[PDB]
Amino acid sequence: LSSFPITKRWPAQHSDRIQLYSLPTPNGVKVSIMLEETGLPYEPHAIDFGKDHQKTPEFLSLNPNGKIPAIIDPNGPGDKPLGLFESGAILQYLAEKTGQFLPADPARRWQTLQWLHFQRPLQRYVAESKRLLGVLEARLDGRQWIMDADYTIADIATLGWVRNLIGFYGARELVAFDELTHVPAWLERGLARPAVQRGLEIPKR
Amino acid sequence: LSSFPITKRWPAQHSDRIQLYSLPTPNGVKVSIMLEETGLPYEPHAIDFGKDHQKTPEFLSLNPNGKIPAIIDPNGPGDKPLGLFESGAILQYLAEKTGQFLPADPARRWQTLQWLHFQRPLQRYVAESKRLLGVLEARLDGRQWIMDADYTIADIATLGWVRNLIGFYGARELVAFDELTHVPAWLERGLARPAVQRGLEIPKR
Numbered sequence A, B: 001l002s003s004f005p006i007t008k009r010w011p012a013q014h015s016d017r018i019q020l021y022s023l024p025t026p027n028g029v030k031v032s033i034m035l036e037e038t039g040l041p042y043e044p045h046a047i048d049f050g051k052d053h054q055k056t057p058e059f060l061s062l063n064p065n066g067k068i069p070a071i072i073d074p075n076g077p078g079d080k081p082l083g084l085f086e087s088g089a090i091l092q093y094l095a096e097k098t099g100q101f102l103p104a105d106p107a108r109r110w111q112t113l114q115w116l117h118f119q120r121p122l123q124r125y126v127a128e129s130k131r132l133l134g135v136l137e138a139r140l141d142g143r144q145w146i147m148d149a150d151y152t153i154a155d156i157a158t159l160g161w162v163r164n165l166i167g168f169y170g171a172r173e174l175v176a177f178d179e180l181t182h183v184p185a186w187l188e189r190g191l192a193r194p195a196v197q198r199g200l201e202i203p204k205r
Helices: A030-040 A087-098 A107-116 A123-141 A155-166 A182-190 A194-201 B028-038 B087-099 B108-119 B123-139 B155-165 B182-191 B195-197
Strands: A018-022 A040-046 A069-071 A082-085 B018-022 B043-047 B070-073 B080-083
Touching: A018 A030, A030 A087, A030 A155, A030 A194, A069 A087, A082 A087, A082 B108, A087 A107, A087 A155, A087 B108, A107 A155, A107 B028, A107 B080, A107 B087, A123 A155, A155 A182, A182 A194, A182 B043, B018 B028, B028 B087, B028 B155, B028 B195, B070 B087, B080 B087, B087 B108, B108 B155, B123 B155, B123 B182, B155 B182, B182 B195
Parallel strands: A018 A040, B018 B043
Antiparallel strands: A018 A069, A069 A082, B018 B070, B070 B080
């Protein structure tokens, strides 16, 4: 892992573990939830955007885009380390590494991938949030998870976003969350999972 | 394909071909380029956003999100039709169906996926465009394609966006395109491909 310059600024205490460079944002918690769900050993590192640490040469050496989350799996394909960014790519990578959180059926596996990139100022944010919730509501009518009986990377990609959408005071009311039926029940099912509970707080801000 | 209600509004003349529901936008041309590159038979259908055709019950029956592109592959997994939206999911699906446009190496295949979701008003659009071009410029320094010698779904996902970014009068100058080196050369290489030339115009607006 010494050949990865990010490790000069965020050293690996456990170089045999997946290194996670992230923040507990809706995009970041996708990957911490996935790591908790799979049970993979990992080492989280909070990336301080308040100090522009995402713009440091060490962070950019892993993700030139300057976004979280990013990982380095020291046990990557061909037993070489693999640095990877883009939360959708990471979720797929971890699903394949573990053989967990994708449906068995090939057609439904492809459909699962659709959900990895699903999600006046406030008025626009509220209108878009409502439109997205409406799509999810339509999908979850008569389904336990986005992919029916199977809990997948689709739920892992979306639970944190919905949780955060209604996080602040007045937010539920603004988006008429409690007038929905299927999203609230699914959110409850997801937040009851201990891996989800853990992932939502990782890394410590 | 009769079980797909979208076909009531955009009938399939060739029901043994992939049906493409799209417009030649930066997101839409990803999939028409991919279809042209692979040589797969397909049937394009322009979705008229000017008449709100993306909000019709027929379109929403395929993509409840109301976005293009979407496909139905009548020859999907298990020889049943498969409806699929989300341009990244579609590009991956078509790469696997054909065995084309992904690197051979497992680590580089994962890295390829990172690029499927890469990309005062005008000032913000120009600043973001410049930042993105800078990332691409850094990647393409010393590389023929985003994934080195291999032309992949990464290039297919990004060529149209760059082409369009500098499409209008003054746009190149605004983003300082001609002060770059590697993006202009790569764009030239990509636009020299006849499949790219074809895909960029499909469906006919």
